[PDB]
Each structure stands twice: as C-alpha cells, then as structure tokens.
Design a protein around this ligand. Structure first.
Ligand SMILES: Cc1cc2nc3c(=O)[nH]c(=O)nc-3n(C[C@H](O)[C@H](O)[C@H](O)COP(=O)(O)OP(=O)(O)OC[C@H]3O[C@@H](n4cnc5c(N)ncnc54)[C@H](O)[C@@H]3O)c2cc1C
Length: 292
C-alpha cells in the first residue's frame, strides 16, 4: 500500500517543470524556491511525508551521471493542483566558501532546481522513498511538528491534507502543533497558507514561530525552535505522555543536537529520562526524524 521506487535511479521519470517561485520575501535571507512538476505522463504516486530524487544534469569527472539528491515532497498526494497530476518541492540553494581559496561554491542539484525555468522538460525524477515521515492512520492523533528551513516541506503536505482538503475516507479530528524556526518574518516559508489555516482551525491547529533575528529570549538571546521546546517543555511532555501523540522533526542536521539537548535538559529538570521516553516512542513508532 505504501509506494516506493516506482522510478529507479537507472531509468527515472522525465518530468516537466510547470512552476518555480521564490518563497523568501524581500528583506529575507537566502533563496528557497517552490518547484512543481507535471508527472501526469507516468505512474508516480506518493504519500505525504515521502521524498523524491532528482538527478541534476551533466557528468562527473569520469563521464558519469551525478548521484540523485533527495527532496521532501511539499505537496499532498494529489499535488497543488488537486488533480493528481503534479508534485512539488521546497528547495534551498546551498552555498559555501572554500576555506583555502575563499571561492564561493553552489550546490549542484539545488542550483539546478532553483534556476530551473518553467517549461523545462527532461527532469529526471526517482520514485517515492520513505516511510519514516508518514502521517499516522489515527485521525485523532496529536501531531507535533518541529521545523527549520526546508524542513517545513512535509508539514505543508500534512497540513493541507489535515485542514485544506476533504477526503472520501479520512478526516483529521486531532490536534496539530507546528513549531517553525526561521531567521526573519520574510523567511517564513508559506506564511500565508499556515496563517490562514490557523485562523480557520483555531482549536485544532496551533502555529508557533521562532524568529531568530526578530524575537529575543529572556537572556536576550535569539529564539530558535529549541527555545520554544524549552519554553513549552511541560506542555510537550504532557502531550508526549498520551499514546496518540506523534512528534516529527525535519530540517538540516544542525537542528537536531540542540533540540535533543533541550529535551534532555528539560527532562532532567523534571526527574524524567529523555533517552527512555524516546526509546519507547520509537518503539511505538511515534517519534519521526528526517534531518539532512
Ligand atoms: C531525505 C532528505 C530530504 C531532503 N529534503 C530537502 C528539502 O526538502 N529541501 C532541500 O533544499 N534539501 C533537501 N535535502 C538535501 C538535498 O538532498 C541535498 O543534499 C541539497 O539540496 C544539497 O545538494 P546539492 O546538490 O545542491 O549540493 P552538492 O553539490 O551536493 O554539495 C553538497 C556537498 O558539498 C560539501 N559541502 C556542503 N556544505 C559545505 C560547507 N558548508 N562547507 C564545505 N563543504 C560543504 C559536502 O560534501 C556536501 O555534502 C534532503 C535530503 C535528504 C536525504
């Protein structure tokens, strides 16, 4: 029932870019783009929380095709057009500077996607992958979603499924809480969507921001997702102690250490053992991490 590898890296589906738009508003930092593809010519089917591979064009030193890179799917199974014909991604352009030359280097695949013109054909896409970030079957589940940057992507999908679509079988009746961390208001990816869902589902959907360059801690420091987890540690632990409660974390690897440590420290403070809680959560399949 869970699709995987409908397309293999050997023979990827060839998609067409039908949209590509900037998500960071003026005054924000960096470039993150929402990139959508028509897939209606193939059998690509997918579930919310899964990922697809992209093979950027060209070759490596040995005349060899590049490795695929994985991108979390930002759309529901039906796609943003709600016609089952498309798939979308949330792509951040990777940049760094060489420590010896000083030269700026741009990630190969993220650059390819960010500069991908609308109309472009021949996009090499590989079949859906992942089971760790799926939405629970329990329609009454409490879903806690921790996100930094492009980590918002599967949660956009979740939320659209939860509050923006009507299904013939499913209907979410639980609580959903998104804690999303970004440096500036301009950098709130999909701000208008989320805020609209919040205004329309005021008792089932809670939207908490952590805006690092605009909001201050009591010590005067920058507010990060981990700062919110600390501020609301009591509430999170109360929630975690319900069996219907799932915690999801997505974004760059660097969000994990400090989040895992806040939980740990806030657990000790309360004579609880966070390794324990996490173990059991993992055994109950209620704790999900996709960090990259
Ligand atoms: C399951 C999963 C989901 C993902 N979802 C998303 C997503 O939704 N959005 C998204 O944007 N990305 C996502 N990624 C990341 C994505 O797969 C790529 O790794 C990313 O886009 C960078 O690839 P690139 O081809 O542009 O960079 P590359 O050309 O691959 O360059 C990256 C590499 O260069 C080196 N490098 C990187 N940073 C530095 C640095 N700071 N200093 C020196 N060397 C460095 C490292 O070897 C690094 O691996 C996801 C990854 C996984 C595995």
């Amino acid at each position: 029932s869970v699709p995987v590898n409908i397309y293999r890296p050997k023979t990827p589906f060839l998609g067409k870019c039908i949209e590509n738009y900037e998500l960071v508003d003026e005054g924000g930092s960096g470039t993150v783009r929402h990139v959508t593809f028509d897939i209606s010519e193939g059998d690509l089917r997918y579930l919310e929380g899964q990922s697809i591979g992209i093979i950027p064009p060209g070759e490596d030193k040995n005349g060899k095709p590049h490795k695929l890179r994985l991108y979390s799917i930002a759309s529901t199974r039906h796609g943003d057009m709600e016609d089952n014909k498309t798939v979308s991604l949330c792509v951040r352009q990777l940049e760094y500077q060489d420590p010896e030359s000083g030269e700026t280097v741009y990630g190969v695949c993220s650059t390819y996607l960010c500069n991908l013109p609308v109309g472009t054909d021949d996009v090499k896409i590989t079949g859906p992958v992942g089971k760790e970030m799926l939405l629970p079957d329990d329609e009454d589940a409490t879903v806690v979603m921790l996100a930094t940057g492009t980590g918002i992507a599967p949660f956009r999908a979740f939320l659209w499924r939860m509050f923006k679509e009507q299904h013939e079988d499913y209907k979410f009746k639980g609580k959903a809480w998104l804690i999303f961390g970004v440096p500036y208001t301009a950098n709130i990816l999909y701000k208008d969507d989320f805020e609209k869902m919040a205004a329309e589902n005021p008792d089932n959907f809670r939207l908490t921001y952590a805006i690092s360059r605009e909001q201050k801690t009591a010590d005067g420091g920058k507010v990060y997702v981990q700062s919110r987890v600390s501020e609301y540690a009591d509430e999170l632990f109360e929630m975690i102690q319900k069996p219907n409660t799932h915690v999801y974390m997505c974004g760059l690897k660097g969000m994990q250490p400090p989040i895992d440590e806040t939980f740990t420290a806030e657990a000790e403070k309360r004579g609880l053992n966070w390794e324990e809680m996490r173990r059991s959560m993992k055994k109950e399949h209620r704790w999900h991490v996709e960090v990259y």
